[model samples]
Target: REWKIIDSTLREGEQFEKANFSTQDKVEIAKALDEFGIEYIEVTTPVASPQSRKDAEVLASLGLKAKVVTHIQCRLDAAKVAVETGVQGIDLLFGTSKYLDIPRIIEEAKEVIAYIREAAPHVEVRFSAEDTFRSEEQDLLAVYEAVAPYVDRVGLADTVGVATPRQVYALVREVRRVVGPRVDIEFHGHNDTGCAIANAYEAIEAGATHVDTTILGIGERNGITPLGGFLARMYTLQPEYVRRKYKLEMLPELDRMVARMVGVEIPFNNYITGETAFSHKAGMHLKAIYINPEAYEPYPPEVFGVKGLHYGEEELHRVTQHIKALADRGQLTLEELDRILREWITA
Candidate 1:
């Protein structure tokens, strides 16, 4: 069960309409992400502008353990410029499906493969087949086969964000069968259909080594995969691979920073780091939780560095009296607790 988190906050996070970070700000975010145990920190294409190159260089000099990666479009020049940024790897991306046909879409897979082969001698490249999850099987296979021989890894992007767990599993299985066991597969999921995390999990179960993520799932349009959501899911399914690697407590700080940088508020209902994720309000739910937390939770909140808060006004007095009785070596029956709750609610 190999799990790796590739943080795209600096690259995809810039897609947020409201985000406008200075070079200093991005450097700070990269260091923070490194401290949080992210395996890779992705920077924008250095060919895009001088600012992007400077930012990548600054982040690389931070001495963070997480490797800095540069994002490149399907251009040899772009890949070369990105390699100059002194980063660990390059995410060379191109659309493989007709749905994402832009003016620059390469019709023949050989053209892309030739470029990758030419560039492979210089840098470690990770080829991304944009929208591969929705592409036709033949095209997907052709693209993978063409570039598989040159790139260090291949990424399957859910570009439209419209894949479920079943689709994810099938696509990953097919890619694995085509590329063989040696080719490392990475899954880059989007959340338009609300199955980003689920799809990523299925991809991993099938055979993906890397998962692309952003803090709070921030990306173009609706969103991309949330970093915390990916980590939480992996921890739930494969604890041994992620437990000590990530500092769960620092998640809140990261969330707050991302929220501020993007000028968006973290929804109260957001999973894990949300304000209300662990809050119990209903009387019956609180009662059940007080007796046995497992009655209402899949796993303990503390496992993710969170504490459950019981906050129903109706249960305050009842809970207090129940605690008092327990402290005094007496038992407060359920009926008595109900009466006390009723009285408190009426008052």
Candidate 2:
């Protein structure tokens, strides 16, 4: 597959309310992302801060298998400094929402690209349009045509999270057509409406080659498409393809570390990394999973480093079946059942 997950746990994830990574933390996370099979590690521009500069230099010099990248606005000064940090490439935004000229934006981008190529020709570059979903189709196509020839990848952003799944698919397809097939496509979505994952899937189906992902989907607002959840969704449909492609076991470690650093719990409903994601409860569910995990669970928890799976089937059956039969024979009443029901529901 031509697609890859651009896990931005450093750049985009730093925008989360609780994320604060030290240089050591950043290095460890970058190493973990590299081990996890992420193809790219994106960081904020060095010009953003003294620590950002140091962190970008550290990440770039780590000799990781995944390419290290830094995001910068379409400004030559910042671009020049970012290129000096020894990163592989730069991710830039078009910044068209400032009520400014798109053509000027294109010129500045081309200048930065030219400078980067001259200075470090091996560096990759990606450009994104701000508030992409809000622009008119014709207006967007025109801007894409002007920008595509100058960049390695172009991104479509759902800046406000107001787009529908179909709309995302259609826009990405349209951008692909306008930008030409050789230029790569990426999709950056917001989760305000809880549609980031769905929108990302649609974008990929519509020919996008990269999807922006943050650990636990943490970022501005409700965050974007989460790394583990997106992987889980794709894994359910194509387990072999997903498993063959990524290091599935590495995710649990990454998830726990990030949650610990950020001082948050991995919600029990979180896919793959949740505390009870692989646990069984109800007796009927217990029986199903006991007989065949696929009967109740869409995936084996072992794929995510979870092991020693079990259901309450054998134990619960042994403990409850005879008691239930005897109780029915003696006397079972709604009042007693009501208490059990209330307690169970609350539990």
Candidate 3:
């Protein structure tokens, strides 16, 4: 299957426990996400709030190639409101497991399907089986069977963020076997178990068509699958399979925007696009990089919108030589280069 992404950074990213964005802020973020070429930008449900409705309308009017989507619960009222938001798609969700014990799990399936059947005429529906990882396989299958007919797509959510890569593969494979290939399957994972990205990749291999992501993985609890890390992993493992359609160079700007709008700082040690993602410290590692960067780095830092920094002060001479090689290629005189190096060292 072709690789496609549905970016939920504006919706789920704003759900970060402490994060909140005004209508204007969300509209700005939605525009930025569209500019970054995410195939879709999920907008939150209006939920009786004036601000949410305003944001949804503004985002829908942006005319981005990315379709606007809204999140809704299983209830018909919520679905109705979501449809009124003017989004191109709606992600309807309900928890299926007995663990959740919502009386609606058993009683609401038919009504939920009815709601989708009713809403399908107005909007595209994507059903989400929330807490799927913990639900009984048989019960989950029942929910899928009940809803697959009316919805355009189905999502398997690791709602508690507890699924491992192996579990992700097994669940997605089972869903494919039961749901058949005709239905579009999406995986929405969280990072509480620190395996969201790995599980997302495994899901793709297991037959999912779309993967959900948020900027820096910021969301409830530990957060969801990180956008930058997942892109880096996919690019590394299957560059040919996944097209580089997004403006990768804007990733750093995206990270900073999310950080500022969400009131969270990018973690220094966070993988890919983090402040320290490409910073090297070991003297031997720095020396190897100085000689033939390929020896120490897996992929060029520039590919992920990162720049490598040689922080080994003791190897300043080696670093200078590497810099000089580039200047020499441009035909700078040795005396002029020496003067520049001397001034740089003194500074």
Candidate 4:
């Protein structure tokens, strides 16, 4: 119930191989995400480039319901620039490899957080340890506990996407234990090993308050948790809560918008927006679906702006007969099914 989505499509999504969002593209994407009811919209660090600064300023002043935030390195200079952009929140990251001194990293984090708090009392601050899953447990906890009191949120990032669900759940629970209930916990995962969605869910189950997601999971390598996929994962468990928090029907447009902007085709297995997402084949599935669509679907197709199977009884029988004959021969492809359906309608 404490879970909120911080969509990083504009920030992490830019790291995607094919992404090149212009100023107008960023504005359009941010607005679409805001309209979908995301709690926060994170943008690139202002210090990345001159245009990056302008985009951050423009987005911060857009008057959207979602809070506009920027992700920056844990440095005083970057923090100063982010604050000047007028963003409502600042996410600071420090890489925590074995080469760095744990105590020194914590000290540096405290200094930056202290400066942000004094300079802009109203700005929300989150300090995350980059590559948290790979870092030493005690080292990560020390950093989190040291800065937890001065920050609004603490984040655990799986930068390389190698974490398992159990590892995510245990680590998140451990961090919760150390940070306590006052400070919120966030999870940012990559999908390299195909555990981003599962890890995010486990993080929530372990008491994380926020989950970082991109539109279609676009980011470095294969990307991170996807907005539509994560929502679909949560909707099955808490349909009312997920529906109340977001405009479920807008998912398709959001997915399409990002895919086109980034010059990539939506994966055929993509969560709510994929072509086969709602398609139900096989006689057994069709029979049960006719009885009750819930029999084959996790959620209603119309709820996400996609229609369900609707065939007249006679037409349904005809199609079923054709499908049965095809199966008796061999496997069928969409092209094969298309030919049969067209011929059936014509006859």
Candidate 5:
């Protein structure tokens, strides 16, 4: 597949309300993401603080398989800071929400991108228009066209999470045309309206070559596309490719680690690693599942080490009855379900 993930657990995820990743935390997360086969790991911009610069430099020099990169505002000063951080790439974004003076902003983008190219010829560069869905299409395409010659990728962000899948698809398709085939297109959608995953899929369908993701979708608001959810979405379409691209089995730990670090519980229905992601209930569902898991599951839970029905026929029958008895009474709490299943499995 031409598409790749630029996991933003350190850059965008740092904006999560409860996130306070130390320098060491940044290292740990970067290493984990690299081991999990993320193609790139974007760190907080060095211009944010002194410690941020130190952390970016340290992470960039880690020698991990993943390329380390940083996100910063579009300015020569910021580009200078980024160039010295040792990151393999630099992502620059310019706000395009207002419909004023776009030509000047385009000029500014060119200047900053040129500075980066001259200062650090080897570093990959990306240019994105912030709040792209809200910006005028004409202005966006113009800005993108101007910078396409200077960047490795051009990005579109649904900065306020207000974009629909159709809009995402159309805009991404338009951007692809504007940038031509050599320059890659990236999609970054916020999830306030719950369209991040769907919008990302549409973007890919419309020819985006990269998508930004945060672990568990942690970011400024509810976050952007989640690493696990996004992968689950892609895996359904191309299971072998997705599986081969990532360390699918380590996803649970990645989810757990980020959840703990941010002091948030993994939502019960979170993709892949959630408590009930692979759970089967109801007589009809279980009956079908017993015959073939494919009856309900799109992919094998074992592929990601997530639990599925892991019991013998007799034991499965016993547990199904127990589950039905409690579920029939009323909605069962997750703890209660775990308690009964724990006893049954151990016994």
Candidate 6:
């Protein structure tokens, strides 16, 4: 199955510790996302606040190539309000950690999904189970089965980022068995355990057609799958296929844009964008990399509009890279690094 990305920057990214987009920012961001060739643009639900509703309406009227979808808290009222406006789709989430009874939640979801279809048959509905990995597998499947016939999609979320890659694949595979092919499967994962990207790929391998992402992986706690990071993961194995689907170079701008809007520096350890992402410092590493990028890199940096190998002796970036890398080794001494550099310096 061809995998699709449901970029949730506007919805989930806003929950990031530093993210705060203005109305103007939202409109411009939507325009930018559309131009960047994203498949879907997800925004916060208007049900949460008047500002959210107005934001969804404004984004919907833009008539973007990417479909506009609003993420709500499994509320029929929110879906109704969103449909009356410009959004073409609705994604509903119910937090299993919220202390709600499972059976009641299942019935409520079924009732709302049916009612929404009756009121607005044109709108697409997607139901997601939050904390899905922690919830009883039976309960997860029960609600999913109940909502599957009524909604367009069902999402499996690693709500607290505890799910491993194999676990994600197995769970998604089971959901596939239960739902059959009539329902689309979506996966949403967080990176607290640093497995979100891997888990997303595993989900895709199993049966997920759609996966959630935020630019730079910004979201609650440590965040979710990063837009560029995941692409880099897939691009390495199938370059031509990835290039055919996305505007590869637009990624740097998209990442830079979101980083600026949120007032956070791109982490130096971040995939692809980090200062050390393409840098090579060790004498052996630089020598091998200079011979061929494929020596150490799984994917070339330039394809995504990034440079490779900050290896010059005078490079501060190389220094920062080494400093961060060495600090993780329980060692960070300028004097020690000076001697180490004297012995390891190279092009």
Work out the TM-score per prediction.
0.79, 0.82, 0.80, 0.84, 0.84, 0.83
Candidate 3 lDDT score at position 81: 74
lDDT of each: 0.77, 0.82, 0.76, 0.88, 0.87, 0.81
Candidate 4: misplaced stretches above 4 Å? 282-295, 308-347
Model 2 residue runs over 4 Å out of place are 97-100, 284-295, 308-347
Count backbone overlaps in model 5: 0
How many Å off is the CA of 282 in candidate 2? Answer: 1.7
**Stretches of model 3 off by over 4 angstroms after superposition:** 101-122, 240-243, 286-295, 308-347
lDDT of 6 by residue, 234-336 (tens): 7876676576566666688888888899998988877787888887655555644466644466777767767677556676677678678878987665534
In terms of TM-score, how similar is model 1 to the real structure?
0.79
What value of lDDT does candidate 4 attain over all alpha carbons?
Answer: 0.88
RMSD of 1: 14.4
What tens-digit string does per-residue lDDT give for candidate 3 at 249-342?
Answer: 5678888888887777889877677777776665556643477654355455665556688676866877578667857688454433443355
**TM-score of candidate 4 versus the correct structure, residues matched by position:** 0.84
Model 3 Cα displacement at 156 (Å)? 0.9
In order of listing, the candidates' clash counts read 1, 0, 0, 0, 0, 1
